[PDB]
Amino acid sequence: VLSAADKTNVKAAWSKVGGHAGEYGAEALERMFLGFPTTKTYFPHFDLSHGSAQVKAHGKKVGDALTLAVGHLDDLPGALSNLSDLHAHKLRVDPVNFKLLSHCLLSTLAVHLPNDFTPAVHASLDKFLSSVSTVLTSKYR
Amino acid sequence: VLSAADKTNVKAAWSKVGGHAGEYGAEALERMFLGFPTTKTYFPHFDLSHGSAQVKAHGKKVGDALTLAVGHLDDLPGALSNLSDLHAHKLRVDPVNFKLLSHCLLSTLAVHLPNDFTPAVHASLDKFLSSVSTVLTSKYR
Amino acid sequence: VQLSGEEKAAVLALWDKVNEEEVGGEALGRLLVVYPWTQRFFDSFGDLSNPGAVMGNPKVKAHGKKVLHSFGEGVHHLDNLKGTFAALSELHCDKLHVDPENFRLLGNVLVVVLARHFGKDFTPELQASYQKVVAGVANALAHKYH
Amino acid sequence: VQLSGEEKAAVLALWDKVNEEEVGGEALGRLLVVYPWTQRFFDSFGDLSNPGAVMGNPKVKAHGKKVLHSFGEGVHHLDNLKGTFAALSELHCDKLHVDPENFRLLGNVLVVVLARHFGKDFTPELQASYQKVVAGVANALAHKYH
Ligand code: HEM
Ligand code: HEM
Ligand code: HEM
Ligand code: HEM
Ligand SMILES: CC(C)(Oc1ccc(NC(=O)Nc2cc(Cl)cc(Cl)c2)cc1)C(=O)O
Ligand SMILES: CC(C)(Oc1ccc(NC(=O)Nc2cc(Cl)cc(Cl)c2)cc1)C(=O)O
Ligand SMILES: CC(C)(Oc1ccc(NC(=O)Nc2cc(Cl)cc(Cl)c2)cc1)C(=O)O
Ligand SMILES: CC(C)(Oc1ccc(NC(=O)Nc2cc(Cl)cc(Cl)c2)cc1)C(=O)O
DSSP states (O other), X not given: OOOHHHHXXXXXXXXXTTTOHHHHHHHHHHHHHHHSGGGGGGOTTSOOSTTOHHHHHHXXXXXXXXXHHHTTTTOHHXXXXXXXXXXXXXXXXXXXXXXXXXXXXXXHHHHHOTTTOXXXXXXXXXXXXXXXXXXXXXXXX | OOOHXXXXXXXXXXXXXXXXXXXHHHHHHXXXXXXXXXXXXXXXXXXXXXXXXXXXHHHHHHHHHHHHHHTTTTOHHHHTHHHHHIIIIITOOOHHHHHHXXXXXXXXXXXXXXXXXXXXXXXXXXXXXXXXXXXXXTTOO | OOOOHHHHHHXXXXXXXXXXXXXXXXXXXXXXHHSGGGGGGXXXXXXOSSHHHHHHOHHHHHHHHHHHHHHHHHXXXXXXXXXXXXXXXXXXXXXXXXXXXXXXXXXXXXXHHHHHHHGGXXXXXHHHHHHHHHHHHHXXXXXXXX | OOOOHHHHHHHHHHHTTOOHHHHHHXXXXXXXXXXXXXXXXXXXXXXXXXXXXXXHOHHHHHHHHHHHHHHHHHHTTGGGHHHXXXXXXXIIIIITOOOTHHHHHHHHHHHHHHHHHHGGGSOHHHHHHXXXXXXXXXXXXXXXXX
């Protein structure tokens, strides 16, 4: 669980995202697929090209799950339990890939919110994404 | 927090350690210093040679802290809070090094308890050492 | 690999006692049990649903033996790990898209298995040399990512 | 580095707009704030006790500029990162004993800083090329560990 100060930074930063969480999720995915091509093999039946309907849709889902996490910082394990079952049990997502997507999310936030993406906020968002990743890899038997 | 099954495996395995936790901690440290020489720089005023009084003493401390953790699996954050302050705030131990020592602890347990170090027990001890490492790196500002 | 002539001799001497079938089956099965995401690459191998099933799976044992045979090739070509592993780097990187972090994990699982098999003969010094070896193998396997 | 001629051109074009002082100070300061264990290597730099102090520290800014200058050398010698970084690999590995994982972290912090500075001009494609670059730099810096 994040510090009080981190939770405050994370809720603050996410407020600056406005209604762009889905857009940012889509762009983070695109950055991941191009920057780290190994990750593409998780999406064999997606059109992964820019502006893809499927990537746009999927980014909305990732953004919505992160928005939900931001609203539930005191209980990420509870909030993300089912999604952790999916990513571990079913999808067998390599834990390394959560670091890759997290890096691409930070990159995307920096692109779009340069004035708000301060060093302290970068640190808190990094901790937030680490915490989310930890829950999402927690279901490994 | 570990699964019920993991806690059972971990308490079981640690029982097989008998009174050897300190010896095993010392040997794990030696394995770490030789296998991963970068780690030696954390101990500038230690004699790091084999059978060293200081390494023997320090291994006892590591073994005692792990024994305490095994007894407090439901609250590792509470049990290891102070030790996490020490390792993060004061010592600035690189999180990578916890993976290195954990690997050397598993190696040492495998050396000495080959019949008990089964695949399922290896998995549970790995999770235990990951959980301990997570708490020990949790104090980073 | 920063392995001296004397370290090299100790590394090859240990490999002379390594049963690649027993050690290989065990190392691959442990990889699949301890780091279950690695099972993603082995759907065709059948039942991997619990530790007993994984360890007893004939395809796991057969494949682990092949893996260990290639590790043995590495052990015997320490001055040319890049060439030794070039074909397998193309397979694992370009064809399979295995994250290279897992090459390091399998190397470390092998080290743990060697420790289990050899006990006190697997000294801290000998383990240190084997750490250099498995790091070199992992790096050579990841060449196609470099 | 698996960088094509066209990717290379885009990478060098971006570096032409990089202020190594501002980008360098910011990347090193962010490393120290986001991954505070890295402060272990900078005791002589004085006050690093909070984000404001780290970012405003003259020694952090001066040193970050030097780091970024060496990254720029890398950018302009992509076909010989090993040679370019050989002296700095001896420094960081043999003398300082920095874990090489941190070379990757600093590269990624630099990428995030480039994203912040360049905004939409730092496209997913251009970032992908920069990921290849910072991976190559990290690998070259870690050579003395290989
Ligand atoms: C911040 C971390 C992540 C979050 C919050 C997240 C969230 C989500 C959500 C909300 C879904 C939709 C589930 C549904 O269909 O109901 C999903 C699906 C999926 N995710 Fe993630 N995810 C994360 C990281 C990753 C990573 C690192 C990978 C692998 C590179 C990955 C691979 C997948 C795949 C393959 C699907 C199913 C796509 C499909 O076939 O429909 N996810 N994720
Ligand atoms: C399983 C993980 C670990 C545990 C349980 C553990 C436990 C301990 C304990 C019980 C102490 C004694 C504290 C005291 O003096 O009262 C200690 C000290 C120390 N530890 Fe660890 N430790 C772990 C990992 C590491 C790692 C990875 C490093 C760095 C490579 C490290 C570096 C140190 C140092 C430098 C000291 C102080 C030595 C001295 O100067 O007295 N520890 N640790
Ligand atoms: C790091 C040391 C490793 C070595 C030396 C190694 C070696 C080998 C060898 C010798 C083969 C056989 C090629 C053949 O006979 O056709 C093989 C195939 C394969 N390896 Fe590995 N491997 C390593 C790690 C991994 C990892 C970490 C994974 C994924 C988690 C992996 C996944 C596979 C797969 C999926 C195949 C093909 C299996 C099939 O026939 O369907 N390998 N490897
Ligand atoms: C990964 C990309 C990196 C590059 C390109 C890089 C580059 C450099 C350069 C150019 C110097 C200056 C040598 C001189 O002018 O005397 C230097 C020094 C140094 N670097 Fe790095 N570095 C990197 C990462 C790191 C990391 C991750 C750390 C530790 C967390 C680190 C710690 C140091 C230290 C302690 C010095 C000497 C500072 C002093 O003068 O006291 N470097 N580096
Ligand atoms: C066993 C089974 C059915 O598991 C699962 C399959 C899908 C999901 N999806 C979700 O959680 N979606 C989801 C979607 C959004 Cl927008 C936000 C959040 Cl927070 C979650 C969870 C578990 C499977 O893998 O087949
Ligand atoms: C371990 C600890 C204490 O802190 C940390 C949190 C985050 C990171 N960053 C990463 O590893 N990024 C990262 C980014 C990429 Cl693109 C690739 C890879 Cl391989 C890794 C490092 C340490 C934690 O878990 O909280
Ligand atoms: C700020 C200050 C004083 O912090 C600290 C310094 C030392 C410790 N040591 C301990 O916890 N020892 C300890 C020893 C054993 Cl055998 C077992 C366990 Cl579980 C813990 C904790 C905090 C410092 O770093 O100077
Ligand atoms: C991430 C997740 C889900 O699982 C995992 C737990 C442990 C490991 N093993 C390691 O990394 N070992 C490891 C060992 C050495 Cl010698 C060096 C390095 Cl660099 C790493 C990998 C994944 C967890 O944190 O629980």
